């Protein structure tokens, strides 16, 4: 306990350092901007293929193809424009909690309770989708996997550690230790040199992909963080937690900027995404309705109540055209 | 209009028929979640049913396909992945009877049982409780007393009464006696009668589920 004391000293120093910077809250600065409150989006498409709970969905960089992960053991790539199914991948493990779509579009990744991030090659000389390589160095369930390139994927796990992988070799080049709880989500920076992680210790950590160490730690929340997403600028991010609160943290200021919580909401947040300009915060909820938040004024500008079951995943296209929400009712909807 | 988007739709409808045929094939198998805190007979019973991460086990008995998921090699927060098993037909929970005096270890089994039995994800999910190592329990109970696990135990130190006491202390941990049933069995090296017990419990659960789908229940 000799050096446990200096941990409180450094915590007080950091708290004072970020207290001094908090001269004016974001809410005061946004008392002049025009509010948006008429955000009403309607279900343009309903993807009906899955026969079980949908745990993860990921949009393609083309804003048209999306990959969907469900517990029927199927990974489905959808044509959001025509509702068509491009591919239906049979997974070895049906307990998949995450799915990523490669920015190039040539691969999809799938992980879950099998502790393996499986890479699937979508574009082969044959016509089938084949397992490119199974990444099996994690000890807990994989909660999130995000592609940095065709050869680099960063995965979060229930082993409390995030890992950076080299796909063609299959070895985790860099491991990211420092959390004390199961890491539940990942969000790559737009430049793909940083990433934030949200774990069950109610803390978010900013990591350096190249360096391998965490530069910042954010601990506004009270319960475990289930969702994390960077602001489109890359300088901020928003976290969703079982606390029923969404927070906004700014890396440069290094603290919480705004809190998105309402009294009518007791359920936690399963997924968080930002609009293309970052003005809207799309958060998934266990009340069966997604909630659009004015990210600058922290007001509920809209509700997406089209799901009869808990929303688990939601994502916005790179074009910003539509927001897709997946839910445990087995249905994935595209909202515009 | 559709030029070759007419053939993408044909593919989208050909890989939508396989999803139905895989969902029909996957919904005809009983899904069992195998649990148990620390050292128990779960590894032992998995041998009795004729088969890191989830150890999925397949076995068929009396034309009924089973799919057992062992989550033992998963050290994480159960709250973050226990909801993945919400639609299991039944939970198989293994408790080692010989752990009453060990390290205390029997009380940990009760904490794990209470956490899952009253879990909001399993309110109707029945539990097949396996009180394993009944042979070691009877050998040990003559010398070591059950008082070392339960201070408030008013009874004799014999196997057939203390075992019933253990079954009562585990079967009274549920607060949902109306909506779900616990099937308890004592097993040490049972000659393939554990599969019979699981089959009977699963058949009762399937019948009760078929009644709930109808209005009879």
């Amino acid at each position, epitope marked *: 306990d000799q050096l446990r004391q200096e941990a409180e000293q450094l915590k007080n120093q950091i708290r004072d350092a970020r207290k001094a910077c908090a001269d004016a809250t974001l809410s005061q600065i946004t008392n002049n901007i025009d509010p948006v409150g008429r955000i009403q989006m309607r279900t343009r498409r309903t993807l009906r293929g899955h026969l079980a709970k949908i745990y993860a969905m990921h949009w393609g960089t083309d804003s048209r193809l999306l990959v969907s992960a469900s517990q029927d053991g199927k990974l489905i790539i959808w044509d959001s424009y025509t509702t068509n199914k491009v591919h239906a991948i049979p997974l070895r493990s049906s307990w998949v909690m995450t799915c990523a779509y490669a920015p190039s579009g040539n691969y999809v990744a799938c992980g879950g309770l099998d502790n393996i991030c499986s890479i699937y090659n979508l574009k082969t000389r044959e016509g*089938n989708v084949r397992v490119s390589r199974e990444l099996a160095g994690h000890t807990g369930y994989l909660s999130c996997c995000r592609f940095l390139d065709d050869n680099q994927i960063v995965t979060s796990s229930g082993d409390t550690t995030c890992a950076l992988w080299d796909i063609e070799t299959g070895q985790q080049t860099t491991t990211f230790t420092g959390h004390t709880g199961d890491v539940m989500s990942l969000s790559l920076a737009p430049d793909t040199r940083l990433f934030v992680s949200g774990a069950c210790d109610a803390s978010a950590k900013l990591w350096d992909v190249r360096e391998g160490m965490c530069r910042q730690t954010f601990t506004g929340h009270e319960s475990d963080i289930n969702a994390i997403c960077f602001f489109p600028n890359g300088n901020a991010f928003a976290t969703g937690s079982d606390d029923a609160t969404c927070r906004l943290f700014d890396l440069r200021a290094d603290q919480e900027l705004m809190t998105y919580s309402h009294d009518n909401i007791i359920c936690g947040i399963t997924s968080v995404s930002f609009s293309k300009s970052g003005r809207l915060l799309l958060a998934g909820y266990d009340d069966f309705n997604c909630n659009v938040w004015d990210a600058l004024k922290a007001d509920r500008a809209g509700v997406l109540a089209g799901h009869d079951n808990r929303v688990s995943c939601l994502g916005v296209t790179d074009d910003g055209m539509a927001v897709a929400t997946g839910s445990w009712d087995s249905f994935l909807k595209i909202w515009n | 209009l559709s030029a070759e988007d007419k053939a993408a739709v044909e593919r989208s409808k050909m890989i939508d028929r396989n999803l139905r045929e895989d969902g029909e094939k996957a919904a005809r198998e009983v899904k069992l979640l195998l649990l148990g805190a620390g050292e128990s007979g779960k590894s032992t019973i998995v041998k009795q049913m004729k088969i890191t991460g989830i150890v999925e086990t397949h076995f068929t008995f009396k034309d009924l396909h089973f799919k057992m998921f062992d989550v033992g090699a998963q050290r994480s927060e159960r709250k973050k992945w226990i909801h993945c098993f919400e639609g299991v037909t039944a939970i198989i929970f293994c408790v080692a009877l010989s752990d009453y005096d060990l390290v205390n270890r029997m009380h940990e089994s009760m904490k794990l049982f209470d956490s899952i039995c009253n879990n909001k994800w399993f309110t109707d999910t029945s539990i097949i409780l396996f009180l394993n190592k009944k042979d070691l329990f009877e050998e040990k109970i003559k010398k070591s007393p059950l008082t070392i696990c339960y201070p408030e135990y008013a009874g004799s130190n014999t196997y057939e009464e203390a075992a019933a006491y253990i079954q009562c202390q585990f079967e009274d941990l549920n607060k949902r006696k109306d909506t779900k049933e616990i099937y308890t069995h004592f097993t040490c090296s049972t000659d393939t009668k554990n599969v019979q017990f699981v089959f009977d419990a699963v058949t009762d659960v399937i019948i009760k589920n078929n009644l709930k789908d109808c209005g009879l229940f």
Partner: single-chain antibody
């Protein structure tokens, strides 16, 4: 991926023959399959097609009724049953695979072919038939479509094939803009619904051959007369 045709030979005019396409190295059941024949010293003509799952079958008007196309997915083979054969059915029949989904490259792989020696349509016209070129020049092959190939979905259904001397055709540009896997970046495609262009930048010795257009907007799939480059 290998597509091997068999069943070709000389037939008296009026007889019957069955063509086989032994397909190995790819998921045959997931690929729609085509038969494209080439009359000797002449251009490509599409004769038949089976969708993946066998649900959709189309035939060329010339062979419709007297030609039958079937596949056996477990046996990984494609069959063309030919009856009432005439003198103008003598051609090298190519077996072609095509997979249809968003972003796919249909007609990507062509079989070797087998020779028979029997003793409205979106007309596609190649303006030229021979083009003298040098190994350093940049030829721009032209193509003309009777009906506009641009669709409401935004896709222009024009494919570019290169058939080298004594070889099967290879897809170079599918949907007139993006080049097929395995093709050098020198090839490029452009066009505006009609009047399409295939631009080659550094014409190597392996670019010499006959270039064929094909429309995939409507069946039957019509090919161009073919533009040849001589070295």
């Amino acid at each position: 991926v290998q597509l091997v045709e068999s069943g070709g030979g000389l037939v008296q005019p009026g007889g019957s023959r069955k063509l086989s396409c032994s397909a190995s190295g790819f998921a045959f059941s997931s690929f729609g399959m085509h038969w494209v024949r080439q009359a000797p010293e002449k251009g490509l003509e599409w004769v038949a097609y089976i969708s993946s799952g066998s649900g959709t079958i189309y035939y060329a008007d010339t062979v419709k009724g007297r030609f039958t196309i079937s596949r056996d997915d477990p046996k990984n083979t494609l069959f063309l049953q030919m009856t009432s054969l005439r003198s103008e059915d003598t051609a090298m029949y190519y077996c072609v695979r095509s997979i249809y989904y968003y972003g796919s490259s249909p007609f990507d792989f062509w079989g070797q072919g087998t020779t028979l020696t029997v003793s409205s349509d979106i007309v596609m016209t190649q303006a030229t038939s021979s083009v003298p070129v040098t190994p350093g020049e940049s030829v721009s092959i032209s193509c003309r479509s009777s009906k506009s190939l641009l669709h409401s979905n935004g896709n222009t259904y024009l494919y570019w094939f290169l058939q080298r001397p004594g070889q099967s055709p290879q897809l170079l540009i599918y949907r007139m803009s993006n080049l097929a896997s395995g093709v050098p970046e020198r090839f490029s495609g452009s066009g505006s619904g009609t009047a399409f262009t295939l631009t080659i930048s550094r014409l190597e010795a392996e670019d010499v051959g006959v270039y064929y257009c094909m429309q995939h907007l409507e069946y039957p799939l019509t090919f161009g007369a073919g533009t040849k480059l001589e070295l």
